[PDB]
Design a protein around this ligand. Structure first.
Ligand SMILES: [Cl-]
Ligand SMILES: [Cl-]
Ligand SMILES: [Cl-]
Ligand SMILES: [Cl-]
Ligand SMILES: [Cl-]
Ligand SMILES: [Cl-]
Ligand SMILES: [Mg+2]
Ligand SMILES: [Mg+2]
Ligand SMILES: [Mg+2]
Lengths: 457, 457, 457
């Protein structure tokens, strides 16, 4: 009796799970919204610098109209290698945002110290492989928030360790690995050799200096005891346990809610893969919500849900999409896009502005939202699936993405727009106000910037 | 000198052969029609109960418009496992019909007794893996009929063993394996422990009770001597020898005639795979032809060919397709569909009715057809490729499929239709007659049913 | 710590490289045009006879509109096997043209004699596998020319060895391997048993007669010292080193210039694979340029570039494409096609004729072009990707392709067209002249042939 080869089955549930972390795939939590949970872990925020520039260059004539295809190929080639290292070292990639990603090693409190050594080692091997890579690490208490409606779900992580990992990463120079103060306080200092950072309590890693008799492969093995989904045994040749997920319509119904419809179309083999890699003109609407205490999920969770319910209803009407949500700019940011594959309306600019205004007015009166700020910017952006075959997400990359984010941060409390949006919109000039030009971290020169003052006053 | 890896080649001929049994793939018989052949074997009819209900549920809002994709995934996950067991145990899957399949172990007469033990073991391992599975087994003489025209071919098996396997399967309770009386008469009774079945000569299998020294792997090995296409040697890692078929335009011309054009389009990479999995509104026209003696291929073969020639010409004109033909309802049944992927006409209902009438009038005068009965039912049905990668077929599943079949059986000798068809058709009310409602095995409640009386009388 | 399987990555650069030889993939030469380089090697020209006939047969009704799919399948099945043998024996496939291919073993001069024995052995194993295969071999000095503009590149090989391999191949009878005189002069005659060929200095191979103690596997191993890209070590399971190419946007920009846009669309997963295999009506415009000395790249290179610049600009305007360029008919031939996938214009015939005339007038005054001849023929031709997964190219095959080539050769110095083109064009009868019918090698019977005299005279 034969025992024939069983070919890998790439069921749709498995394809869906590539778009999500283990935190969601294996989370099985309640469908109530908001839902919050609490745990401890180590975070790694990894940023490839330079892709934002490459993006502008990939529009030039030398790319012969295959800029999008060439960009995504060279991006994924690099990001794939970073993803593999993260996964092999036992991390869970939570989210990709542009040319950056955030990874989590969730463990019990007693295990943080040892897992920090694992993540440092991982970081040093990533910084090794290689555009510059910058890595921020943090460790401690972490909250998760899941919010949404009956057809869409989103998650975010929240708390001091989350704020820290982003602060740590911004201090990083080309190729630095930076530890948050708490991470440094919790790590095995007898092994980790650091320099201090000026006017900063975070530290920089110089190297690992293991003691005699220390064997990293053995230490790692001990650490895998604490890793719930590390591939092992018959599945030790796989990068993710999620590669083994079997059809389950209840689970798939729950997981699909996190993935955009156009991605589900590709997964379902109802649209060519090539279709979603593009360099296309879009409008970015970047919404920031600030709270009195951005580390307190039980306060901010309801407010985020409330804002989300309104945001999604106005985006439906003005035809936009939420690409990504994350904690950023001392608050919760929604990266919204008008003109994704299949949503290209005319009057996109006008609508992006009226939508931004509606969101601004409504969110300003949600309880516990202290300040709303929205940046609107338009131009050619890269849209596509970024990452590894086994772990990847749809994202946007471009100078207008960064501009919209910087606008919302440097012009808090108002709706701002760039010149392309201003000039191209339908709206009368006196609905706007020309603003003082600010020097903005990561921005060569915006043309003129404007406040969208709106119809009255 | 290198000896590089030879990658599997998925030539179009190999893709075509997934849609057919070995009985056809390796049959090399005459292209004359009808063609009949005669042999002996064991039949296994396997039915997954419950998918017909799942189908209705997969239309609900909770599936978020991915019902078809979710249905086919969970269906194939289960059916795939059953297919693998059948193939590993040396069976040839002849046909899929909805959530059921029919498999054949063709052998010489002297080998039936031993092969029955093999098939029982297979059945018990299938009933093991697991919606309820019901299995009917029969053994004996089998006739094959191939009918068609110069561009299309169809086959069917015929005879007492075929009638038996279907009778045996209908008696099965959830998870029973039932043997036909002849199978029980031919099997190795010293090994097989049964209970009797009330007012029935068929029996139920309780278990295999092998004698001392009996080793199933050795016994199976002996039995493979009689299996012409069991994968072996260098190909013992394959589920089917047909996976090794090499391009041959004469063979491919002959095999393609059994596969619908829209499936050939997908095989040819001229249409996305996703395209053919759908939950779509269709009209089922289920035609039953009864003969004086439904076990006698030399009598019924010509008549079936004759009916087929007419059926296919009227379906071409009213725009329908033959999905499947099989012996059923004490006769030969054609499962015909109006509105498959690419054939969606307006006035589909009217046309389905006029086509049904034309087929009824013509077939009623074909010599040797005793009674024609046709059931017409309309609604949302699942259409898609069901089975394993290496062995799968396009099929339809749904409550309106079952209704059309039950109508043709419980209202013999006339053309009947459901309420959706009646109400939606173009035709005047007096072309119909409202019928007495019958209690119908496998039907909760049809709305009102009608006879299509037609234009005169 | 796991060491998971790394799946093959089929990056777009790797897909592009399937369409090119190692001579270009690993060439890294200047982007200036023309560019010429010089080396030595052995050439193998392999021709499958009979596919041109098969092509006409695959249009008949018996193929049920899947002629194109069936033709390409049976063609690639055979050509694939020849490609594998060439690659395993260390050859570089330079180009496919219809059902023929040209392969190169580039080496230093001292190594020609040994490499000739390798290529003879290869040839004998190819002639073995098997429509008739005919093989011509030549050896000596070879020039390469790369020509083009800022978005398109083409290469060609030139010189006496190139003329020889084509002459040798035309003398071959069914299943002969023929050596050019120089190849025979350079080979290891103590091992190679030949017959002479009448009124010919080329010879035919009867067999390899190795001496005692000669071991082909050891000899081959020694010879691989001289083969720069022979897959070895960790990559010895691959048919081509190019299968390992990694993303590199500079390299990909340079390589894509050789591949047509519609092929890049498929590579980019923006078009279904099936789309480019077709039997479609096209117009072939076959341009031949003769020079005083067709073996002298430094003279003819500039002229070819000059002609190319004009040809490509008129083809853009009359909507045609260069399919292939190669030395042929004592000159440089451009195989141009009107009506490829996506370029089907109305008045295609008229335009093909006016384009042919423009090219004829311009090329006749390029310095160093002695004679221009152009054959125009229209009908159903096979268009598709021919070859092996790892090495394949888009090509055209058909009786009208061969007719256009024979016309340009047998009616030098003028533009000629077939009857389909004449009758179907828009143009007045007196723009043409009906020509004397010539007996043409490889042509059963053209209908009437015409000169396109043009508007004046
Ligand atoms: Cl997050
Ligand atoms: Cl998100
Ligand atoms: Cl059947
Ligand atoms: Cl059938
Ligand atoms: Cl060439
Ligand atoms: Cl070429
Ligand atoms: Mg970045
Ligand atoms: Mg059923
Ligand atoms: Mg040829």
């Amino acid at each position: 009796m034969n025992t024939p080869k069983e070919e890998f089955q790439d069921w749709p549930i498995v394809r869906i799970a590539a778009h999500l972390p283990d935190l969601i795939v294996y989370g099985h939590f309640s469908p109530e919204r908001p839902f919050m949970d609490y745990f401890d872990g180590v975070l790694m925020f990894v940023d490839i610098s330079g892709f934002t520039a490459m993006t502008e260059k990939f529009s030039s004539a030398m790319y012969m109209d295959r800029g999008a295809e060439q960009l995504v190929e060279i991006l994924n080639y690099h990001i794939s290698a970073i993803v593999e290292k993260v996964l092999i070292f036992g991390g869970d990639i939570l989210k990709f945002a542009g040319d950056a990603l955030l990874a989590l090693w969730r463990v019990e409190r007693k295990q943080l110290k040892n897992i920090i050594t694992v993540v440092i080692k991982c970081s040093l091997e990533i910084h090794g492989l290689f555009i510059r890579v910058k890595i921020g690490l943090a460790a401690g208490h972490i909250s998760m928030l899941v919010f949404g409606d009956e057809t869409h779900s989103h998650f975010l992580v929240i708390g001091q360790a989350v704020d820290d990992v982003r602060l740590a990463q911004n201090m990083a120079q080309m190729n630095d690995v930076i530890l948050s103060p708490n991470c440094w306080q919790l790590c095995d200092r007898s092994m980790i050799e650091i320099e201090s950072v000026p006017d900063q309590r975070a530290v920089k890693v110089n190297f690992l200096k293991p003691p005699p008799n220390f064997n990293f492969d053995e230490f790692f093995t001990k650490c895998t005891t604490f890793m719930h989904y590390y591939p092992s045994g018959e599945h030790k040749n796989l990068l993710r346990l999620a590669c083994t997920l079997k059809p389950d319509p209840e689970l798939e119904m729950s997981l699909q809610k996190y993935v955009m419809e156009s991605i589900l179309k590709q997964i379902d083999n109802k649209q060519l893969q090539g279709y979603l890699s593009e360099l296309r003109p879009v409008t970015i609407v970047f919404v920031n919500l600030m709270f009195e205490d951005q580390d307190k999920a039980e306060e901010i969770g309801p407010a985020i849900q409330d804002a989300y319910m309104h945001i999604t209803s106005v985006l439906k009407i003005f035809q936009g999409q939420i690409n990504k949500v994350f904690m950023f700019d001392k608050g919760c940011s929604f990266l919204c896009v008008f003109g994704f594959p299949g949503e290209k309306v005319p009057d996109e600019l006008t609508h992006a502005l009226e939508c931004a205004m509606d969101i601004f007015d409504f969110c300003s009166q949600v309880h516990k939202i202290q300040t709303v700020s929205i940046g609107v910017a338009s131009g050619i952006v890269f849209c596509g699936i970024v990452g590894h075959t086994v772990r990847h997400e749809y994202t946007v990359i471009g100078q207008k993405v960064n501009l919209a984010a910087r606008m919302m941060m440097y012009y808090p409390g108002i709706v701002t727009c760039d010149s392309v949006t201003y000039n191209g919109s339908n709206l009368p000039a006196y609905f706007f106000k020309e603003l003082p030009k600010k020097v903005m971290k990561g921005v060569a020169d915006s043309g003129p910037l404007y406040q969208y003052w709106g119809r009255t006053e």
